[PDB]
Amino acid sequence: KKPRQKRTATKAYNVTQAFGRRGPEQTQGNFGDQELIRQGTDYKHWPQIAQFAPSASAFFGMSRIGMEVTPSGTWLTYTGAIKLDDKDPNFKDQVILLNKHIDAYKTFP
Amino acid sequence: KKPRQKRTATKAYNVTQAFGRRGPEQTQGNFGDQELIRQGTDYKHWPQIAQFAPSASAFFGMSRIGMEVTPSGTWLTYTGAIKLDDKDPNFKDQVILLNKHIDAYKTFP
Ligand SMILES: O=C(/C=C/c1ccc(O)c(O)c1)O[C@@H](C(=O)O)[C@@H](OC(=O)/C=C/c1ccc(O)c(O)c1)C(=O)O
Numbered sequence: 224k225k226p227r228q229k230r231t232a233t234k235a236y237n238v239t240q241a242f243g244r245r246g247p248e249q250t251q252g253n254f255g256d257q258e259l260i261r262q263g264t265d266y267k268h269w270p271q272i273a274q275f276a277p278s279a280s281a282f283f284g285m286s287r288i289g290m291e292v293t294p295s296g297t298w299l300t301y302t303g304a305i306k307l308d309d310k311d312p313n314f315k316d317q318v319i320l321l322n323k324h325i326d327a328y329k330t331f332p
Numbered sequence: 333k334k335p336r337q338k339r340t341a342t343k344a345y346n347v348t349q350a351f352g353r354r355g356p357e358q359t360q361g362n363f364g365d366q367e368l369i370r371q372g373t374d375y376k377h378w379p380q381i382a383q384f385a386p387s388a389s390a391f392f393g394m395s396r397i398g399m400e401v402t403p404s405g406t407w408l409t410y411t412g413a414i415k416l417d418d419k420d421p422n423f424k425d426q427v428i429l430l431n432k433h434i435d436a437y438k439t440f441p
């Protein structure tokens with residue numbers, strides 16, 4: 224199996240299997256409704272989500288990168304923000320799609 | 333020009349041009365020494381850095397994702413942490429390489 228950061232979720236290997244249960248904790252993933260969790264990149268609107276994912280160059284160019292050495296190991300930390308184009312005619316639908324998946328786990332077991 | 337998150341830095345379109353100068357503010361990237369800044373993905377050790385960058389699936393699976401509406405526009409926020417494999421024979425070289433680039437800008441004239 225690939226390193227966690229290189230994994231690709233699909234119906235055969237879903238978001239929970241690849242990335243763990245969604246939840247509220249720092250360094251727990253919070254993104255995905257039940258349909259996306261189950262289907263990963265097989266999700267019918269995956270392209271409209273993936274348009275916001277950074278290239279490796281942009282991940283290392285845009286982000287605040289840190290390194291932490293703790294009792295669990297050595298961790299590369301990252302924070303950043305990606306600006307949506309509010310002049311894109313698809314902007315309202317993009318906001319609706321992203322909001323549908325952000326913290327969706329709070330509404331189901 | 334591509335949306336910022338899809339840009340690829342190269343010798344012709346470098347990290348400063350693609351992603352802005354390195355600096356300490358939360359809106360700036362902090363990653364890259366003078367050689368990676370000038371070369372982007374032409375950098376001789378780029379693969380050893382890119383191995384830590386998340387797939388589109390992992391970026392949305394591992395990260396804490398948010399949406400912030402501020403005076404400057406609408407932002408998709410991301411945070412998370414990637415564990416190094418201390419059983420990787422290249423672990424000690426990965427630590428040295430990441431230490432060369434994190435906040436390297438502090439040493440520039
Ligand atoms: O990267 C740039 C911009 C380059 C550029 C612009 C327009 C062009 O048309 C072009 O071809 C290139 O400069 C910086 C910026 O903007 O302040 C960028 O600095 C550096 O890496 C400098 C490092 C350094 C290290 C050791 C030294 O001894 C020394 O003298 C300098 C940063 O700190 O992020």
Ligand code: NA
Binds near residue numbers: 427431
């Ligand atoms: Na160290």
